[PDB]
Amino acid sequence: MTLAILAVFSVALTLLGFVLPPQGVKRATLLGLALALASLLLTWGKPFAFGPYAVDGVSQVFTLLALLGALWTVGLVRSGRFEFYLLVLYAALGMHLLASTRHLLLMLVALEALSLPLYALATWRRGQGLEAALKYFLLGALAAAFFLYGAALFYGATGSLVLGAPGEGPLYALALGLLLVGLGFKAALAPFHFWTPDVYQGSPTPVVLFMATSVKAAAFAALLRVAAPPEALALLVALSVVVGNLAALAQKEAKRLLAYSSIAHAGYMALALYTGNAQALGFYLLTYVLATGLAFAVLSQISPDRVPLEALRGLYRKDPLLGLAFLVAMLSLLGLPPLAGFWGKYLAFAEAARAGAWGVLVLALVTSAVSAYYYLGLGLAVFARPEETPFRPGPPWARAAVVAAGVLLLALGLLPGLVLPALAAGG
Amino acid sequence: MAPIQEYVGTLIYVGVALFIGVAALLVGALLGPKKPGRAKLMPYESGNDPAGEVKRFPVHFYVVAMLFILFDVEVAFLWPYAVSAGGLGLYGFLGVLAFTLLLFVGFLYEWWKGVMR
Amino acid sequence: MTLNVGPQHPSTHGVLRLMVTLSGEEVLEVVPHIGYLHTGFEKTMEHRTYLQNITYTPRMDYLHSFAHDLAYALAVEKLLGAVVPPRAETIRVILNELSRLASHLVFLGTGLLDLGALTPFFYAFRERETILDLFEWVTGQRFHHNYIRIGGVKEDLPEEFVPELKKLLEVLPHRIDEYE
Amino acid sequence: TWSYPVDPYWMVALKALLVVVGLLTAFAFMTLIERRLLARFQVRMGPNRVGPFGLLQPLADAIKSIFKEDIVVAQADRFLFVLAPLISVVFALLAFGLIPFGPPGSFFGYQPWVINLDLGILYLFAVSELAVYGIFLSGWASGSKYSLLGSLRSSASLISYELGLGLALLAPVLLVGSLNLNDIVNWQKEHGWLFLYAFPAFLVYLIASMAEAARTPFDLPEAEQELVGGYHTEYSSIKWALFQMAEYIHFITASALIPTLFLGGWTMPVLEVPYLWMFLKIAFFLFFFIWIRATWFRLRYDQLLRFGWGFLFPLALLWFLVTALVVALDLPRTYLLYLSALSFLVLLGAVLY
Amino acid sequence: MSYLLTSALLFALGVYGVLTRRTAILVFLSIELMLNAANLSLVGFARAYGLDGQVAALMVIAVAAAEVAVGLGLIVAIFRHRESTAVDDLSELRG
Amino acid sequence: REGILFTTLEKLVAWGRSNSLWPATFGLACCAIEMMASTDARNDLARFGSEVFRASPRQADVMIVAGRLSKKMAPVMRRVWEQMPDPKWVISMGACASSGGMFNNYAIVQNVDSVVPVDVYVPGCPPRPEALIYAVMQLQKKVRGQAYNERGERLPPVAAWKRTRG
Amino acid sequence: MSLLEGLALFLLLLSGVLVVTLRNAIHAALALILNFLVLAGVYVALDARFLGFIQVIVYAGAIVVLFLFVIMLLFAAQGEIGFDPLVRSRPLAALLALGVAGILAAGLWGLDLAFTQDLKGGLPQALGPLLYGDWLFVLLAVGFLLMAATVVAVALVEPG
Numbered sequence A: 001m002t003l004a005i006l007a008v009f010s011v012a013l014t015l016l017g018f019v020l021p022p023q024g025v026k027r028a029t030l031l032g033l034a035l036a037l038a039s040l041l042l043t044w045g046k047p048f049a050f051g052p053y054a055v056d057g058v059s060q061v062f063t064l065l066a067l068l069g070a071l072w073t074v075g076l077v078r079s080g081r082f083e084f085y086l087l088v089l090y091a092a093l094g095m096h097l098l099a100s101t102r103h104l105l106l107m108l109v110a111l112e113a114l115s116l117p118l119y120a121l122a123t124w125r126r127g128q129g130l131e132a133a134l135k136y137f138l139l140g141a142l143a144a145a146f147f148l149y150g151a152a153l154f155y156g157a158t159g160s161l162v163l164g165a166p167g168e169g170p171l172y173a174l175a176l177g178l179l180l181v182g183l184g185f186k187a188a189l190a191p192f193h194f195w196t197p198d199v200y201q202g203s204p205t206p207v208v209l210f211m212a213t214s215v216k217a218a219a220f221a222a223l224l225r226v227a228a229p230p231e232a233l234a235l236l237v238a239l240s241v242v243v244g245n246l247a248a249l250a251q252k253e254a255k256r257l258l259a260y261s262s263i264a265h266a267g268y269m270a271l272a273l274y275t276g277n278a279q280a281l282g283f284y285l286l287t288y289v290l291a292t293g294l295a296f297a298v299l300s301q302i303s304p305d306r307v308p309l310e311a312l313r314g315l316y317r318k319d320p321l322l323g324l325a326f327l328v329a330m331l332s333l334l335g336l337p338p339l340a341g342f343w344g345k346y347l348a349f350a351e352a353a354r355a356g357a358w359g360v361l362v363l364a365l366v367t368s369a370v371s372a373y374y375y376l377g378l379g380l381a382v383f384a385r386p387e388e389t390p391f392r393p394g395p396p397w398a399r400a401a402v403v404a405a406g407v408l409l410l411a412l413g414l415l416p417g418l419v420l421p422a423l424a425a426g427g
Numbered sequence B: 001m002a003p004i005q006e007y008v009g010t011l012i013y014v015g016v017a018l019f020i021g022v023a024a025l026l027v028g029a030l031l032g033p034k035k036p037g038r039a040k041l042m043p044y045e046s047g048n049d050p051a052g053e054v055k056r057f058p059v060h061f062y063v064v065a066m067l068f069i070l071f072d073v074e075v076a077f078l079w080p081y082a083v084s085a086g087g088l089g090l091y092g093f094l095g096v097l098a099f100t101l102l103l104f105v106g107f108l109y110e111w112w113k114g115v116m117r
Numbered sequence C: 001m002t003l004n005v006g007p008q009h010p011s012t013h014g015v016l017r018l019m020v021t022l023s024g025e026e027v028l029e030v031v032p033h034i035g036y037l038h039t040g041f042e043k044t045m046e047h048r049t050y051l052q053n054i055t056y057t058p059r060m061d062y063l064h065s066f067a068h069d070l071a072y073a074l075a076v077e078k079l080l081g082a083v084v085p086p087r088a089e090t091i092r093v094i095l096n097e098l099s100r101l102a103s104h105l106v107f108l109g110t111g112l113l114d115l116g117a118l119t120p121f122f123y124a125f126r127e128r129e130t131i132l133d134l135f136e137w138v139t140g141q142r143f144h145h146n147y148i149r150i151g152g153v154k155e156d157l158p159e160e161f162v163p164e165l166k167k168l169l170e171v172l173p174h175r176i177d178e179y180e
Numbered sequence D: 001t002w003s004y005p006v007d008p009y010w011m012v013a014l015k016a017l018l019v020v021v022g023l024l025t026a027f028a029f030m031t032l033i034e035r036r037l038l039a040r041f042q043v044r045m046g047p048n049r050v051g052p053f054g055l056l057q058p059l060a061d062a063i064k065s066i067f068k069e070d071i072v073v074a075q076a077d078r079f080l081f082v083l084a085p086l087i088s089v090v091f092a093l094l095a096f097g098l099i100p101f102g103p104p105g106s107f108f109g110y111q112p113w114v115i116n117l118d119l120g121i122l123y124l125f126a127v128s129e130l131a132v133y134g135i136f137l138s139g140w141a142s143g144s145k146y147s148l149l150g151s152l153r154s155s156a157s158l159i160s161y162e163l164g165l166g167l168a169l170l171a172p173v174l175l176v177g178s179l180n181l182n183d184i185v186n187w188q189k190e191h192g193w194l195f196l197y198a199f200p201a202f203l204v205y206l207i208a209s210m211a212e213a214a215r216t217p218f219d220l221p222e223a224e225q226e227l228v229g230g231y232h233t234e235y236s237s238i239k240w241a242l243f244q245m246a247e248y249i250h251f252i253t254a255s256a257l258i259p260t261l262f263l264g265g266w267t268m269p270v271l272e273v274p275y276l277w278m279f280l281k282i283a284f285f286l287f288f289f290i291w292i293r294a295t296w297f298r299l300r301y302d303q304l305l306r307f308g309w310g311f312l313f314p315l316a317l318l319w320f321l322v323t324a325l326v327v328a329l330d331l332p333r334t335y336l337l338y339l340s341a342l343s344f345l346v347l348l349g350a351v352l353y
Numbered sequence E: 001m002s003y004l005l006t007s008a009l010l011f012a013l014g015v016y017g018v019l020t021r022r023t024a025i026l027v028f029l030s031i032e033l034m035l036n037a038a039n040l041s042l043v044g045f046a047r048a049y050g051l052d053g054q055v056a057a058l059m060v061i062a063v064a065a066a067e068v069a070v071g072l073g074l075i076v077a078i079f080r081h082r083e084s085t086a087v088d089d090l091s092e093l094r095g
Numbered sequence F: 001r002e003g004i005l006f007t008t009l010e011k012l013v014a015w016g017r018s019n020s021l022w023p024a025t026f027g028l029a030c031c032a033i034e035m036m037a038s039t040d041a042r043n044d045l046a047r048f049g050s051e052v053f054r055a056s057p058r059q060a061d062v063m064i065v066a067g068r069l070s071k072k073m074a075p076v077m078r079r080v081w082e083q084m085p086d087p088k089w090v091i092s093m094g095a096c097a098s099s100g101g102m103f104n105n106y107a108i109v110q111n112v113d114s115v116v117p118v119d120v121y122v123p124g125c126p127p128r129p130e131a132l133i134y135a136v137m138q139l140q141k142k143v144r145g146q147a148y149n150e151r152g153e154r155l156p157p158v159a160a161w162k163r164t165r166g
Numbered sequence G: 001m002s003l004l005e006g007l008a009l010f011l012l013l014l015s016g017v018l019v020v021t022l023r024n025a026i027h028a029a030l031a032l033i034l035n036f037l038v039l040a041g042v043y044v045a046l047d048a049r050f051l052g053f054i055q056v057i058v059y060a061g062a063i064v065v066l067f068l069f070v071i072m073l074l075f076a077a078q079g080e081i082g083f084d085p086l087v088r089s090r091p092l093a094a095l096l097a098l099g100v101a102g103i104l105a106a107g108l109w110g111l112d113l114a115f116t117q118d119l120k121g122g123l124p125q126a127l128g129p130l131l132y133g134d135w136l137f138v139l140l141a142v143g144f145l146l147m148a149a150t151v152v153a154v155a156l157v158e159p160g
């Protein structure tokens, strides 16, 4: 009964924007997201399904993360176009529907419904924004066509469009591949990774925050329902992580480097799919969402258009707490103790080893060790000598959000046996 | 329902209509003076420029067509409820009413924003 | 869209060319272009007798001509001092207002037809036909009538003119009230 | 076609060819009658010439139509130039066989109709959309952007009101429950004259047909006196003839459909004659429509868009939802009669303020 | 079964279009062709597996209409002031 | 095929073209008002076949030059003649158009036959509406091969059929 | 069957080849409309009757109508401007188009299915209870998707 809250707020605001100032609309959107988050929590351990809409721990956790990302990215959006808020609402609802069903066709409708408002939110009208939106839309519709033929061949291998069917030989494998194409594209897995750097570089920074958190979250929420074979999973992980880290080595701009890093991180998250633990992946994505939203909130405080790596430098002297949280985020994404990224990474690797894929895991670990080069070149750059750089030291809004993100990251890294007990049915 | 023979009869209808249309066009084309001239083949309005060199046409017609495709999808969804109505009862009526209200919210949004633009 | 509304097309009465600077459905600005009817009354009148020019005066405004006839006659009278009989002045105002009725009929007919309905053109124009016949009684011509003179009017009215005028004057009030 | 037989394919082809040449003769003589009726409206009288009743003047017109140098204009698409009139005519002729001109077997043995598809209104809807297709395509192919803009106005308006046609047609489907015209006509046989139940939607159907070039937008446009129209202005001998032919067939198709759907398709309570009542109702609607042609002004396509989009279509869907509640709950069939009579009294009393 | 093979071939043709085309709109057309091939496969497997693929293809039509509307808005916004719709004309974002 | 090459077919199509005369006015001056008056409810050229009035030149066979033809308009009107379907006819209405009339000056074409091939001339100022009907009936019998000059010669059905346009 | 079935399939594939091959955008869209007509006939042949009629109404009648409206507002018919041709990608592209079918052909090869079901015609009479009901949730999701799509396009053009 959370989706009803989302729908009510969205539909009412669609008209209320004519009588309410965009700021009042922003307050309304924020209230709706907080109410939906609270309704999700009060239903913790209360799975609820009416039709093909089915809420389990996965729906609960991933929609909680998506709602967090939406709240954070709405805090920064201050444009006087109430539409620039409405779309955000949609995506949340859309992503909710993505994690809340097993029906492949409702999965497609949910994907389109959460993705379309992103295409429009990416228009600050900066000439790069147009190029980004065009690549995004074209490649996304291509992936949607592939995913739809996959759902069709699924219906061919089984009488229902719901996942879990027994499955045939070549036809079921082929349908699985045609679904995996779109799902990995949405999750920014290579060799479907091309769109992510360009789109993250072109889009306004807070929108990139929202994307790199909630879109990847919901994409893996949908992947968890699929029974992806180990060969496909291994190929995706290998190619994704390798290209992610390597192409990130060559990056000169923070947002493009972070997009390649997120490709590598989707490659890592693709390990928990070996078992579909939904506990390992839930934990990993919790930590990743917090850290990446933090990093992109800081980057938005720097510049929405584009931020080079040098702009990050001197940040500690500029703002100490900000530099500290940025260091925490770089290390947590590096998955280093005593930070929660280590626990998420370990849980994914434990799922992988339990599935019995060893060489893939070793290659992932080597690529993660290579990643430390730029992870430190970003985290440690905070202390460097400040060069010429625009700096907007946020409102107390973004400061408090960043502080809470870093605090939750370290708290759950130090004592993970606090929430990890309740990632199953929810005791 | 209806037998499939009616659809082959429909194909025959199309065949006769198309045949007669092509026959009429042949009558028109073959019976004529056929003295082509340079200015005769020129589009219109005395040398050049009926409209001439103009910027791309208003997007208003794009919006007209997009509105139309969306609302025709609406109607295509409303018809299956129109045929089976008494059987779907208040449940189907309520579902169709909520659906209609969603797309009517879309209409009211585009109207209070308007497209004179 | 610098649109070239050509002369006479699309159906732009009174041959005239228009350059409609136009974006969308509005009208940014219309640049008119005229001269397609330049005949040269002001030049040809320099080479025609005063009496002959009364044949050139109605042809400029061919709808309300008797105002041109009157203007030219009055100007030449004031120039050489002619004495207008009173009945000539009465008849001149009669013919002036009558040709004004015919001009106004044509203006509103063309306007309604140009955009709107085609029907109301006929009825008004029908009454115009009636008016035209009156001139044929006295001038022998529909319009371009050479009836005015320097002193007054050319010759006296027939017996049959006035009763037809009364017929039309009694049918007209209901008619104009119907258009209104 | 649950209870109705199927004629042989050769008989279907025979009836089709007959319907098409009859539509030809009908639109020629209806051009005559419209000329004379508009004439009578404006007290001038029509062509008492080449006839006497004029009934040999369309022959002279057709004789002009061919031999008139069917011209291929330069700067025009070689193929679409010739193809678009064919599209407009093909997709205009058909969708008229479905109209029942009598009870089964009343074609002197086989079938009053040509095809009686299970889904009729959808076929009508699709072939009505393809007419707008031909309109704006010919506008484009002409190579004249002046005429292109008129083609765009035409297409926009026709498309908007063509959308409204769906919500107009929704209401009676609830009552009859079938998408074949014969079931609907038989329902008007039993309960009687569906417009009594659904007069408001009938209205938004009627006015919708005005937007399909019938009249009073009248900024369709025709090339005359406004931003010139599309789909003509570059075709001379036979293609122009095909454009006018298809437009008039569409006019008469609407004039025939309006009584078939809401009012009494022939099926009279009295004298139950197959063809004569339907043709006479066609004549009534045609005369009222020519009255409109003569008697009313233009709309300028902006107020036309406003009236169609903001007024007609929401009203049609409101009535559809009302009828849907009533039918699914099936409480009486009387409630719709009462509500339509009351609504007509409302939309009537507001006139003479 | 020839229907399903033809749907696969139409998907392949749409792939060839998306890859070969230079214009954005023609790529979008090839994608629509891919969608219709998918719909044909769905109708065949509904004939096989009990009629659900028909409602499936209906919802697919509606999804297609949504994405067509939004994508054409995009195509408008990006190439309104700009020159030729050629998709290679925008190479600002490089690796 | 030009309405020719069969003894019956050419008389038939001459009948058809004659009663199917579609007048396309090119309203220039006070002649044009007396042509518009030939459409009202006293004297309508709406019987012989001339009811419909297509402003487009691609659609009409009779071109009626009704008014003075000033030189600045001479090519424009000219092109409307070139942009007409080939079975086309041209009438010169009034004195200013037929000859230079009384405006025998620098501005006015002294015979519209200069720019367009004229079929029939109709004097008058303005030519009475019934006279314009007379000229269209004259043209009717001219395209029937029923028209002779003062010198005994029969006049061909279509003027503008004998000219090397350029 | 096979008599006209071969015809329909040959026309379908030929139209696809046109829509992907022709450089006339208008002619490509027209070949896709012809494809849609052939495909609606195929749909009806497959006992889906309502779906073929909507395929003509919405897809051909509405979608590619807006496509044509866009390419007529923005001429774009001669697409080959601003080339960057990458000529060698033209054969290579087809290669991938081959594979994307072949593996599908492999997954569908040697695949025989029970094509025996009395659909009773794909009429909406039976689809009503299926749509409003088992699909009502997917229906309402679709409706919200379209409403949001309208809002997205409005805010996307929105010159201000």
Ligand code: SF4
Residues within 6 Å of the ligand: C059, F029, F030, F031, F066, F067, F068, F093, F094, F095, F096, F097, F101, F124, F125, F126, F127
């Ligand atoms: S001939 Fe007489 S009526 Fe005709 S344009 Fe000349 S002045 Fe006017």
